[PDB]
Structure 1
């Protein structure tokens, strides 16, 4: 499988979510699927980001919990985990 690369930005987001009650079970399943280069099912709204954010992709773990990630050179890079406002609106 791909090697995981958790950026520090992702670690901080994850630790903040945990303190706010986040359950990471679905996240873990999504991560494994991505590491195996398999497609996510339709609920995850998996897609490529545009503009500034290329070449990253985004999927929805929950409606206010988005995962921003990239497959590059044998890694799955996990960049951010949080709300649309936190990730994209400087929140």
Structure 2
């Protein structure tokens, strides 16, 4: 499968967000699909965001999750993680 990466944002938005009042019980579901091998589906409204987040890609793996990442040459990179109530 494609390559995966992590940024300073995702690093603090993954484990540092869990203890920051984030439901770690829901992560086990999203982190289970990305940390296993199952790639994101096109039905997750995955595409370029609007505004200042133009040079990025969003994808709500769950109805309460919004993981941001970038598409590189035969390589993927994780940007950050948020929620419908967080990112908003």
Same fold (TM over 0.5): yes
Contact 1:44 1:61 in 2 (8 A): yes
* TM-score normalised according to structure 2 size: 0.61
Structure 1 gap segments, 5+ residues each: none
* TM-score normalised according to structure 1 size: 0.60
Contact 1:26 1:61 in 2 (8 A): no
Which structure dedicates a bigger proportion of its chain to strand?
1
How many residues end up aligned between the 2 structures?
88
Which structure dedicates a bigger proportion of its chain to helix?
1
CA RMSD of aligned residues (A): 3.9
Deviations 1:9-39 (A, max 9, x none): 1011110344379788997997898899997
* 1:48 positional shift: 2.0
